Structure 1
């Protein structure tokens, strides 16, 4: 499971999710899934969506995982009165904004990739579409 190995700090602020993401192009391959939503993907979902594709081709093509968690989420232990310190690190997530290219796939005809992304999306929360590499 992808996880930032050995970073600066363990717990970090709740933060905010404003604006538009940076990576909006299909950079590495030929086909890519762009996220038309605005939410927070978890590491669990990431690898899950990976399996749907890793299975969708069985062995052909190259898969690029654009995003990376980099955000630690905590949670208070069950039934503990509020207060008494900051939570305990549970799991990691990667913030998402619209117009972000998440999975970039190359090596297969537009057909299967179109089909492949239909499987990845069913595991991810936010609405996403399928976009292609264009010229400049």
Structure 2
């Protein structure tokens, strides 16, 4: 999984996922999987999509993960009442806005990139799209 080594505080507020993305353009690779819809990805979904995409392209070329979790999501145990403090940190999500290039890759042709990106996008909760690297 992906998780920040020594984050500053262990628990953090919920907040909202409002607004659009920042990593809009395909910058490191030639092909990218871009988020169409809003949501948040746990580190398990990110690593599962990475494994499926890597098995698909058989470890040729390079694959960039353009998003890090860095947001602890806490969750209370079972059969516990409300109150008594904030719950223990159980996983780490990444807040994903529309227009966010989640993944990038290069070194592979466009057809195997297309099949790999379907095989990776099947693991994520959000709707995605395939985008190509543009100039300007």
Band the TM-score falls in, shorter-chain normalisation: over 0.9
Distance 1:15 1:111 in 2: 39
1:24 is displaced (CA, Å) by 0.5
- The aligned counterpart of 2:2 is 2
The CA RMSD measured in Å over matched residues stands at: 0.6
For normalisation by structure 1, the TM-score amounts to 0.98
For normalisation by structure 2, the TM-score amounts to 0.98
1:58 is displaced (CA, Å) by 1.1
- Point out 4+ residue stretches in structure 1 off by more than 4 angstroms: none
1:77 is displaced (CA, Å) by 1.2
Give secondary structure in 2 for the equivalent of 1:56: helix
Distance 1:56 1:6 in 2: 33
Q: How many residues align?
A: 136
Gaps of 5+ in 1: none
Distance 2:41 2:56 in 1: 21
Gaps of 5+ in 2: none
Give secondary structure in 2 for the equivalent of 1:90: strand
Distance 1:111 1:80 in 2: 51
